[PDB]
Structure formats: structure tokens, C-alpha cells
């Protein structure tokens, strides 16, 4: 149930998501690439999914990876903006899942993003509390996969 | 070239884009659905492309349509935010075009969105001058299709 998962986003969780997002969301290009490069470093077994992006080890220098990384941050921007209305949050998460489902990305696969997020947050001085909050948002997406 | 197209975005054009976007982009759910509904109303032939969305005549009530309309607006949010750096605008546009090319959407088909955009702008009192500005942004994407 995606709705039950969204119900886990309590007042405190939503507050922490916004506070952290105010910082990491201000530099979508920088933090977006950092998130992807950390994913490829910690989970090399996922690189096979981004073969269209060429040599992802190039990081910021790869124009295809940079385009994907920036675009990725706008999906998160969308989720944060829908935190007030769970009905809209759910419909945008299901729309989001469509393409990832077509790519055969399973919930187990997607959950691997939690590590990179925790590390990116940490580099910006955000601790456990914030990593946990984001883990709850990702859970909503997983329930839709 | 997508890069050459991005050159049409002069200072005055980028100004009208941001000014108009501050308004139509302030209500993504509302205007986003207006864009889609207007598209289906004036260009019935495009309804076949969105069969996944189910019954698009339901408008706001259709969760799938609402989810798509809100997500669509964040693609435009992305373009607007990259206006000052042609390099970033280009890579995000090419990324964006990937899925639309796989769906067989030609540059001419995509251009059909100009009509709906014009009307949505007009509903907020933004005249031909702004419509033309947006037509140039859409042209950038067309250069990649
Ligand atoms: C917070 C996590 C994530 C976000 C916000 C995110 C966001 C996005 C967005 C916005 C797109 C572009 C639109 C589309 O094609 O659907 C996309 C594409 C893609 N995503 Fe996700 N994604 C995330 C995690 C993942 C993970 C963990 C995988 C795989 C293990 C994955 C694999 C893909 C692939 C392969 C593409 C296509 C890239 C390309 O060819 O350009 N995504 N994702
Ligand atoms: C202002 C122009 C437009 C924007 C910003 C836009 C944005 C988007 C976005 C963000 C997606 C979701 C990610 C993905 O590509 O899978 C999408 C999907 C799609 N777009 Fe575009 N689009 C635009 C115009 C059009 C037009 C004119 C057509 C065709 C007449 C079109 C056909 C499609 C289709 C068929 C989908 C998949 C919908 C589904 O089955 O869920 N788009 N578009």
C-alpha cells in the first residue's frame, strides 16, 4: 500500500525533509552528480542500468550524466512540493514509478539509493535524523514498484 | 543544433519566460492540467499517445492525468532554471528528448503544445509577446527531436 507508506510522513518527518532540502536542493547540479557518483561507487552492480550515459566515472565532465543528475533532482523537488497533499504525492509517485518499472527496477534495487543519500546529507552536515526522514520518502516510491 | 536554438533565447526572451513562469508556474497542478485538457480539446489526435492515462476526459479527477500534468510542469521548471547556462540547458533538453524520441514524437507533433501554452498564458493576461517567447523555448526542444 502506497497510501499507508505516505501516511508515515508525519509532521516532523516532513519538516526535516524541507529543512534538509532547502540546502541540498539549492545546488541541484552539484549534489545531483554527487548522489549518482556515490551510487556507482558504493553499488557498482547498478552501473549496467545507465549504459546510455557512457563513462559515468567522469562525473561532472560527462554531459549526459550531468543532464540526468540535474533532472533527477527535479523529481525530488516534485515530491517535496506535494508533501501537503498525500493524494497528489501518491499520483506523482506512481507516475514516477512507471518508467522505472518498465526498466525492471525492483523495490530492492531502488532502496540502494538510501546509502548515497545518507552520505550526501552527511557531507552537508545533516545526520541520522535526516537520513531516516528521506528513507521514509523512498519507501513510498518502493511501495509503488 | 540544440546549442544554436538556445541562442534565440536573448535577454529579453529569458526575461519574459521568467516573469510569465512566476505566475503559471506558481500553480502547477491547476495550470498543468489546463495545458493537457486544452491539448486534448484542440488536438484530439494526440489522445492516442496517452492511453496509459486512461480516461483523460475526467480531468482533475483522473489521478493518472493529474500526476502527469504536475510532473510535466517540473520539466519546464528545469528548463527555466537553466536558461543562463546554455551548456546545462542543452544537456537537460537532450536527456528530456530521449523518451519522447522513443515514443516517436516528431518535432512537428511536439510543436502542437504551442497552442495550449498560448491559451493558458492568455488566461493570465500574458499576450502574444510571451507566447512567442515560449515558442522559442519549445523550439530548443524541437531542435533535439
Ligand atoms: C531518489 C532516486 C531516484 C530519482 C529521484 C530518480 C529520478 C529519475 C528521473 C527524473 C529520470 C528521468 C525520467 C524517466 O526516464 O523516468 C530517471 C531515469 C532513470 N532512472 Fe531513476 N531515479 C532515482 C533512482 C534510480 C535508481 C536507484 C535506479 C537504478 C538502480 C534508476 C535508474 C534509472 C534509469 C536507468 C534511468 C534512465 C537514464 C537515462 O538513460 O538517461 N533510478 N530517474
Ligand atoms: C511543454 C511540452 C511537454 C513537456 C514539458 C512534457 C513533459 C513530459 C514529462 C516530464 C514526461 C514524463 C517522463 C517521461 O518522459 O517518461 C512526459 C511523458 C510523456 N510525454 Fe511529454 N511533455 C511535453 C509535451 C508532449 C507532447 C506534445 C506529447 C505528444 C503529443 C507528449 C507525449 C508524451 C507521452 C506519450 C508521455 C508518456 C505518458 C504516459 O504514458 O505516462 N509530450 N512528458
Curated annotation (Swiss-Prot), chains A, B:
Protein's cellular compartments: Cytoplasm
UniProt: heme b binding residues: 100
Main subcellular location: cytoplasm
InterPro entries in UniProt: Globin, Globin-like_OT, Globin-like_sf, Globin/Proto, Mb-like_M
GO molecular function: heme binding; identical protein binding; metal ion binding; oxygen binding; oxygen carrier activity
Occurrences of domain Globin (ranges): 8-145
Entries under CDD domains matching the protein: Mb-like
Alphabetic keyword roster: Cytoplasm, Heme, Iron, Metal-binding, Oxygen transport, Transport
One Pfam family here: Globin
GO CC term, one of those recorded: cytoplasm
Subunit: Homodimer.
Family: Belongs to the globin family.
Protein's UniProt name: Globin-1
UniProt lineage: Eukaryota, Metazoa, Spiralia, Lophotrochozoa, Mollusca
Amino acid at each position: 500500500s502506497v497510501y499507508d507508506a505516505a501516511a508515515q510522513l508525519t509532521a516532523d518527518v516532513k519538516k526535516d525533509l524541507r529543512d534538509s532540502w532547502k540546502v541540498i536542493g539549492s545546488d541541484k547540479k552539484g549534489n545531483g552528480v554527487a548522489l549518482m557518483t556515490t551510487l556507482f561507487a558504493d553499488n557498482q552492480e547498478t552501473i549496467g542500468y545507465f549504459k546510455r550515459l557512457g563513462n559515468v566515472s567522469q562525473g561532472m565532465a560527462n554531459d549526459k550524466l550531468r543532464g540526468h543528475s540535474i533532472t533527477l533532482m527535479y523529481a525530488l523537488q516534485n515530491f517535496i512540493d506535494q508533501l501537503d497533499n498525500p493524494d497528489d504525492l501518491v499520483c506523482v509517485v506512481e507516475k514516477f514509478a512507471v518508467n522505472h518499472i518498465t526498466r525492471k527496477i525492483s523495490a530492492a534495487e531502488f532502496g540502494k539509493i538510501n546509502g548515497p543519500i545518507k552520505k550526501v546529507l552527511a557531507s552537508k552536515n545533516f545526520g541520522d535524523k535526516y537520513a531516516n526522514a528521506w528513507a521514509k520518502l523512498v519507501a513510498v516510491v518502493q511501495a509503488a514498484l
